[PDB]
């Protein structure tokens, strides 16, 4: 038993059927967007129908929104002639052809690698337009080539999500150390931090082991441990967006010429960060308010394209200050059946 997702035009008979709503990638290869279209024989000369896969990228900041400019670009646009008035098919496409009928025209897209995943920036209450981020869309045009204008009635628009999952290899656990020499003679202060693991799932607790060796003439006042999320925007040379999604301040003090080891638990979640405008979250379809953006994996030997999301645990000690950063990956694992891509309890 298998089921597909169908999108129908407001007018006429133009129905697009897609097997799955998520098209994941394995760095080396990307799952192809395979689907079918049913179009009624309502045309006389316009016997050409096109399918366009567009990886649109939009961005807007608070200062830019106030000024009145919002960046927009098309990272990758692929056009395929669905109707052949070569191109191997799949078992799902063959089953769709058999069930739908002879009019079922297939279309297959092979998404090239080194493309950003579907990540949408969280919009504030003021923003009411298109979602800011990278969105993958499939648009069906029943018109004579691309010369004619795009018609809302004829075109079928369906939002698809390209996401990555946690790698099979967990990777070495982060372990970051920093020794600082104070201006008062040669008095070294040592800080070290370690994580339970390198790959982290959304909602899972994060355990950080922090050890401080004070050989100075000052006492540490407070320790701030935060989970910074960084959103590198390669296009338009936009400045890096850094946002603390979780924080913990400890008033404990460490005496000079003494050692102190402790463990801290930080669990990032969206409820506390719901008011952070511009935060990068997972791909959205109809404003479902998905989880935090899964940290993209740059396994390629590394291209400046789209939005690159990363997470780092930052530990800061005051009395200047000593700051250390431990990168970690906050990515969803491979789901058993499929990602629902929506709030499972609708109400």
């Amino acid at each position, epitope marked *: *038993g298998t*089921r597909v997702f169908k999108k129908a035009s407001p007018n006429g008979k133009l129905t697009v059927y897609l097997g799955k709503r998520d098209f994941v990638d394995h760095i080396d290869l990307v799952d192809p967007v395979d689907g079918v279209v049913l179009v009624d024989p309502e045309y006389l000369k316009e016997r050409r129908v096109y399918v366009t896969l567009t990886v649109a990228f939009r961005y807007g900041r608070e200062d830019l929104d106030v000024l009145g400019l919002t960046f927009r670009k098309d990272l990758f646009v692929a056009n395929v002639q669905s109707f052949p008035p070569k191109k191997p098919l799949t078992r799902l496409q063959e089953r769709l052809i058999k069930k739908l009928g002879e009019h079922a025209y297939p279309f297959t897209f092979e998404i090239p690698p080194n493309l950003p995943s579907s990540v949408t920036l969280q919009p504030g209450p003021e923003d009411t337009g298109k979602a800011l981020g990278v969105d993958y869309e499939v648009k069906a045009f029943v018109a004579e080539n691309l010369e004619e204008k795009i018609h809302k009635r004829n075109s079928v628009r369906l939002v698809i999500e390209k996401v990555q999952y946690a790698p099979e290899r967990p990777g070495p656990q982060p372990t970051a150390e920093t020794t600082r020499q104070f201006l008062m003679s040669d008095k070294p202060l040592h800080l070290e931090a370690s994580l339970d693991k390198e790959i982290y*799932y*959304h*909602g*899972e*607790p994060i355990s950080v082991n922090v050890h401080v060796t004070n050989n100075t003439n000052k006492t540490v006042k407070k320790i701030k441990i935060s989970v910074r999320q960084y959103a590198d925007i390669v296009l338009f040379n936009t400045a890096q967006y850094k946002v603390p999604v979780a924080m913990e301040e400890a008033d404990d003090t460490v005496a000079p010429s003494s050692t102190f080891s402790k463990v801290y638990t930080l*669990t990032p*979640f*969206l*409820a*506390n960060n*719901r008011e952070k405008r511009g935060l990068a979250l997972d791909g959205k379809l109809k404003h479902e*308010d998905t*989880n935090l953006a899964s940290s993209t994996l740059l396994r390629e030997g590394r291209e400046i394209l789209g939005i690159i999301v990363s997470y780092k645990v930052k530990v800061k000690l005051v009395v200047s200050d000593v700051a250390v950063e431990l990168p970690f990956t906050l990515m*969803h694992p491979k*789901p*058993k*059946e499929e*990602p*629902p891509h929506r709030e*499972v*309890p*609708e*109400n």
Partner: single-chain antibody
Framework: DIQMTQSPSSLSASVGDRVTITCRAS??????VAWYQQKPGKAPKLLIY???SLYSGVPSRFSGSRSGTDFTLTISSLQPEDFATYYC?????????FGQGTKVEIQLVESGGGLVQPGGSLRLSCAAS????????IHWVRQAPGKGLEWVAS????????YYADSVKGRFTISADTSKNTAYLQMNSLRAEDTAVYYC?????????????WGQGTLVTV
């Protein structure tokens, strides 16, 4: 709300036979229908989740199918230990009330039970082990004698969402102590309207792979 109809009301078959149970929904549910089972004196256990996808930890004899709105649960062989009460649940929409419940015939810890005054406040404590409140959604479901399970409360700490049934709205408060990694349920009510045993179950936080783990529960008598 969406009401689920479960048939047959009572079923009896020989050991090793094939038993088919039908579940009809009020409207379309987008195949977000699960099948649970419970034994007398025992907490319910999930059997089938997410449109006939078998859950880990249960025998492969159980199978599911979906024909439009109708859902079918098929048991190829009726094992001697496979004599339990089956329920059909839909979690596509809130409320997530279960089905009528069919009968077949030939970690989480809950506390806070005991004698209850006719009108007053009750507190139920749910100790959770092996998982975090931000990595799962905590639900509280009551079961009254002579009737099946009924969804009552749901809390999702990751999204900060809370949901209550219409019959319990305005009087039920559910909280998740992340530091203590536990759940608290406060119910200020009157009479014996909520004289039922309460189970503290959990579901996957994001994809909601059914109510896999169910609490033992404690008896509440008004």
């Amino acid at each position: 709300d969406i009401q689920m109809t479960q048939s047959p009301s009572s079923l009896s078959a020989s050991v090793g036979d094939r038993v088919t149970i039908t579940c009809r929904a009020s409207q379309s549910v987008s195949s977000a229908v699960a099948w649970y089972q419970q034994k007398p004196g025992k907490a319910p256990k999930l059997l089938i989740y997410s449109a006939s996808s078998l859950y880990s930890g249960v025998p492969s004899r159980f199978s599911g199918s979906r024909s439009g709105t109708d859902f079918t649960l098929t048991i190829s062989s009726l094992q001697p230990e496979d004599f339990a009460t089956y329920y059909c649940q839909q979690y596509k929409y809130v409320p997530v009330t279960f089905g009528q419940g069919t009968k077949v015939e030939i970690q989480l810890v809950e506390s806070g039970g005991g004698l209850v005054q006719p009108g007053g406040s009750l507190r139920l404590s749910c100790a959770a082990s092996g998982f975090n409140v931000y990595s799962s959604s905590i639900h509280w479901v009551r079961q009254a004698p002579g009737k099946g399970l009924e969804w009552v409360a749901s809390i999702s700490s990751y999204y900060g969402y809370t949901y209550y049934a219409d019959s319990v709205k305005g009087r039920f408060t559910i909280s998740a102590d992340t530091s203590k990694n536990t759940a608290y349920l406060q119910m200020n009510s009157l009479r014996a309207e909520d004289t039922a045993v309460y189970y503290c179950a959990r579901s996957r936080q994001f994809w909601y792979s059914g109510l896999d783990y169910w609490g033992q529960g404690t008896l509440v008598t008004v």
